[PDB]
Design an enzyme around this catalytic site. Structure first.
Site, mmCIF file in Angstrom:
data_model
loop_
_atom_site.group_PDB
_atom_site.id
_atom_site.type_symbol
_atom_site.label_atom_id
_atom_site.label_comp_id
_atom_site.label_asym_id
_atom_site.label_seq_id
_atom_site.Cartn_x
_atom_site.Cartn_y
_atom_site.Cartn_z
ATOM 1 N N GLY A 153 1.316 -1.371 4.435
ATOM 2 C CA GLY A 153 1.686 -0.049 3.954
ATOM 3 C C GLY A 153 2.645 0.652 4.896
ATOM 4 C CG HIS A 154 2.680 3.693 8.729
ATOM 5 N ND1 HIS A 154 3.220 3.684 9.998
ATOM 6 C CD2 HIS A 154 2.818 4.961 8.268
ATOM 7 C CE1 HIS A 154 3.680 4.881 10.291
ATOM 8 N NE2 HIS A 154 3.437 5.682 9.263
ATOM 9 C CG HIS A 208 -5.111 -1.538 9.882
ATOM 10 N ND1 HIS A 208 -4.513 -0.946 10.977
ATOM 11 C CD2 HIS A 208 -5.665 -0.536 9.159
ATOM 12 C CE1 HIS A 208 -4.750 0.352 10.948
ATOM 13 N NE2 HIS A 208 -5.437 0.629 9.849
ATOM 14 N N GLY A 209 -1.637 -2.732 10.315
ATOM 15 C CA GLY A 209 -0.734 -2.760 11.431
ATOM 16 C C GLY A 209 0.303 -3.861 11.398
ATOM 17 C CB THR A 219 -17.503 -2.797 13.949
ATOM 18 O OG1 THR A 219 -16.085 -3.029 13.791
ATOM 19 C CG2 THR A 219 -18.313 -3.483 12.830
ATOM 20 C CB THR A 220 -16.822 -1.349 18.791
ATOM 21 O OG1 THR A 220 -18.232 -1.166 18.990
ATOM 22 C CG2 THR A 220 -16.051 -0.842 20.024
ATOM 23 N NE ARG A 251 7.153 22.027 3.045
ATOM 24 C CZ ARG A 251 8.490 22.116 2.952
ATOM 25 N NH1 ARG A 251 9.125 22.161 1.763
ATOM 26 N NH2 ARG A 251 9.187 22.192 4.066
ATOM 27 N NE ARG A 302 -7.115 11.904 6.309
ATOM 28 C CZ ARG A 302 -7.385 11.653 7.601
ATOM 29 N NH1 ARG A 302 -6.403 11.374 8.448
ATOM 30 N NH2 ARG A 302 -8.639 11.639 8.055
ATOM 31 C CG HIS A 303 -3.291 9.167 1.787
ATOM 32 N ND1 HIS A 303 -4.118 8.417 0.964
ATOM 33 C CD2 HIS A 303 -3.492 8.686 3.042
ATOM 34 C CE1 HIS A 303 -4.792 7.542 1.687
ATOM 35 N NE2 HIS A 303 -4.426 7.675 2.950
ATOM 36 N NE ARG A 313 -6.984 8.010 4.215
ATOM 37 C CZ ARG A 313 -7.212 7.139 5.205
ATOM 38 N NH1 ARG A 313 -8.435 6.993 5.712
ATOM 39 N NH2 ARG A 313 -6.209 6.420 5.692
ATOM 40 C CG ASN A 333 -1.762 1.323 1.292
ATOM 41 O OD1 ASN A 333 -1.305 2.437 0.950
ATOM 42 N ND2 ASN A 333 -3.013 1.159 1.738
ATOM 43 C CG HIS A 383 -8.099 4.427 1.437
ATOM 44 N ND1 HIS A 383 -8.319 4.433 2.796
ATOM 45 C CD2 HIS A 383 -9.300 4.685 0.865
ATOM 46 C CE1 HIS A 383 -9.593 4.680 3.041
ATOM 47 N NE2 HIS A 383 -10.213 4.829 1.882
ATOM 48 C CD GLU A 399 -6.892 -6.199 3.721
ATOM 49 O OE1 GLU A 399 -6.319 -5.437 4.547
ATOM 50 O OE2 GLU A 399 -6.929 -5.969 2.503
ATOM 51 C CG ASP A 449 -2.905 4.856 0.896
ATOM 52 O OD1 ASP A 449 -3.045 4.766 -0.343
ATOM 53 O OD2 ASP A 449 -3.638 4.280 1.711
ATOM 54 C CG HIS A 450 1.367 6.271 5.065
ATOM 55 N ND1 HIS A 450 0.288 7.115 5.178
ATOM 56 C CD2 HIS A 450 1.156 5.284 5.965
ATOM 57 C CE1 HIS A 450 -0.559 6.647 6.078
ATOM 58 N NE2 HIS A 450 -0.056 5.534 6.570
ATOM 59 C CD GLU A 483 -6.800 -0.275 1.555
ATOM 60 O OE1 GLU A 483 -6.038 -1.223 1.866
ATOM 61 O OE2 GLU A 483 -6.755 0.834 2.148
HETATM 62 C C1 PXP Z 1 13.644 28.295 8.227
HETATM 63 C C2 PXP Z 1 13.637 27.073 7.349
HETATM 64 N N1 PXP Z 1 14.702 26.780 6.630
HETATM 65 C C3 PXP Z 1 14.770 25.697 5.847
HETATM 66 C C4 PXP Z 1 13.717 24.789 5.690
HETATM 67 C C5 PXP Z 1 13.858 23.593 4.790
HETATM 68 O O1 PXP Z 1 12.921 23.758 3.710
HETATM 69 P P1 PXP Z 1 12.587 22.433 2.831
HETATM 70 O O2 PXP Z 1 12.032 21.398 3.789
HETATM 71 O O3 PXP Z 1 11.571 22.934 1.837
HETATM 72 O O4 PXP Z 1 14.003 22.052 2.353
HETATM 73 C C6 PXP Z 1 12.454 25.059 6.445
HETATM 74 C C7 PXP Z 1 11.247 24.237 6.448
HETATM 75 O O5 PXP Z 1 10.995 23.794 7.547
HETATM 76 C C8 PXP Z 1 12.459 26.230 7.282
HETATM 77 O O6 PXP Z 1 11.368 26.475 7.993
HETATM 78 C C1 PXP Z 2 -8.016 -2.461 4.350
HETATM 79 C C2 PXP Z 2 -6.611 -2.030 4.655
HETATM 80 N N1 PXP Z 2 -5.578 -2.889 4.633
HETATM 81 C C3 PXP Z 2 -4.305 -2.565 4.885
HETATM 82 C C4 PXP Z 2 -3.965 -1.243 5.198
HETATM 83 C C5 PXP Z 2 -2.548 -0.815 5.502
HETATM 84 O O1 PXP Z 2 -2.268 -1.038 6.896
HETATM 85 P P1 PXP Z 2 -0.834 -0.516 7.392
HETATM 86 O O2 PXP Z 2 -0.563 0.769 6.659
HETATM 87 O O3 PXP Z 2 -1.125 -0.364 8.886
HETATM 88 O O4 PXP Z 2 0.103 -1.625 7.010
HETATM 89 C C6 PXP Z 2 -5.033 -0.220 5.268
HETATM 90 C C7 PXP Z 2 -4.791 1.197 5.549
HETATM 91 O O5 PXP Z 2 -5.040 1.865 4.551
HETATM 92 C C8 PXP Z 2 -6.404 -0.622 4.972
HETATM 93 O O6 PXP Z 2 -7.413 0.289 5.014
#
Ligand code: PXP
Ligand code: PXP
Lengths: 242, 238
Positions: free
Chosen positions: A214-215, A192-193, A101-102, A19, A50-51, A46, A8, A44, A152, A10-11, A71
């Site tokens: 993923g993570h 997951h995890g 679910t809970t 940025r 967000r990602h 969303r 995965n 995923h 899954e 996403d991250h 996903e």
């Molecule tokens: C004062 C300052 N200098 C340098 C950087 C580095 O910038 P970049 O992550 O875009 O290289 C940052 C970002 O946190 C900053 O705030």
């Molecule tokens: C269904 C499913 N499986 C797996 C993952 C990934 O889990 P992790 O990033 O904790 O490995 C996620 C998170 O997006 C998910 O929603």
């Protein structure tokens, strides 16, 4: 009985969206991950984006050289995108309070009809559908009546267990759920995890088809690089089934 | 001659805080970076701690083998924390709507008090500012021995004319600031593809680079990412 690894990514997109830059690009990761022993790529999309973004999804579908796993929340907007993009896999997950679910799994049983219909639309267009559920015999039954070929199982409780007895119980919960799901003819995935340090017992389960992860990978990747991180998870998984 | 690289490890933590986890750990990124050619470690402690935490600063303070540079807004709490932690450098930076670079000129008395308190416990203080002669003077007035020139606009130039115009503005500011006795740093938005013209400026003391480094890292690994950035900086000054 070769367990498949879905990476995965996403991250990678989390890092990007922090940025508004073009890097790092999830599309690059997909290539690294597949050539380092991933069997699939997961993203995923969303509702809030967000990602991973629509830009990502539409390019990945044209660049994934393995199988793409999409996903998404169970919504009409997302079922449209899915029926357009046609990934090999969809995995339906909760993103709202009323769908979860809970425990964190998708409430298949509280919304059977909504599920069946979503599945229906995805399947009619050739997609194979997974519902991310808890290790729960009632949710498993629901997914069958939903017509979902795959589930899954949510490995979160298994991942977060503070103690040895707890870990054991959660593990047996997953074990039993995998045995049951498969009985009823379901193909069974988990995720997951999962980490470099808890994957084996989950990997060792005969019924597991693919592990979705993923993570931990992305997290190892910033230190050692994604090629190394993916290969090392793949190795642990191979070794788990000796 | 010699150009230092400060690696901002903030976005290692971006990656960790997304989940509740322990990894990836900024503490490790720091050993890796320092050892692949970074000459200092920068972290920005936000009031909102959205990436780097106090846990992070506390441990880094004891693990860092080069020198620490703590980026912070000008608040009482932040100046207190930096008086306890005692980094080698402090970089003062806008965070709220009332603080582009810092508006030193607009708030010269406040910046003077702040520069004063930090420097009284041995901290080398840097003010993060636009490439503006006026803000440069306000820096000198506030006592700060360092400025860091914001390179955001340069990095975002979408046309060649815009790029040259931002580059000369930075070049002239570096020239002028060095002509007022400042040590001149630069940063924000520097990548493997736009670093060399900035690296090339004879006045530059240290480039502080984060995101582009973390961004390459998830692909190629932290070590290579840091090392390759270092090479580009050496090659620029040939
Ligand atoms: C004062 C300052 N200098 C340098 C950087 C580095 O910038 P970049 O992550 O875009 O290289 C940052 C970002 O946190 C900053 O705030
Ligand atoms: C269904 C499913 N499986 C797996 C993952 C990934 O889990 P992790 O990033 O904790 O490995 C996620 C998170 O997006 C998910 O929603």
């Amino acid at each position: 009985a070769d367990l498949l690894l879905g990476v995965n990514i996403d991250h990678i997109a989390t890092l990007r969206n922090a940025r508004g830059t073009i890097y790092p690009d999830p599309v690059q990761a997909a290539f690294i991950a597949e050539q380092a022993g991933a069997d699939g790529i997961t993203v995923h999309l969303r509702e809030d984006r967000r990602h991973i973004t629509d830009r990502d999804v539409r390019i990945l579908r044209q660049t994934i050289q393995t199988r793409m796993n999409l996903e998404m929340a169970v919504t009409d907007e997302m079922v449209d995108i899915a029926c357009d993009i046609k990934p090999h896999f969809c995995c339906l997950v909760p993103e709202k309070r009323q769908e979860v679910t809970t425990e964190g799994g998708l409430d298949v049983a509280g919304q059977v009809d909504k599920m069946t219909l979503a599945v229906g639309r995805l399947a009619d267009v050739g997609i194979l559908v997974s519902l991310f559920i808890d290790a729960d015999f009632r949710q498993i039954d629901a997914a069958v009546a939903a017509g979902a070929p795959y589930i899954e199982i949510h490995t979160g409780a298994y991942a977060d267990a503070s103690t040895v007895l707890e870990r054991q119980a959660e593990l047996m919960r997953i074990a039993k759920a995998a045995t049951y799901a498969a009985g009823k003819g379901l193909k069974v995935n988990a995720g997951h995890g999962l980490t470099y340090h808890n994957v084996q017992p989950i990997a060792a389960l005969p019924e597991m088809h693919e592990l979705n992860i993923g993570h931990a990978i992305i997290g190892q990747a910033v230190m050692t690089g994604l090629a190394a991180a993916v290969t090392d998870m793949k190795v642990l998984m191979r070794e788990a089934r000796r």
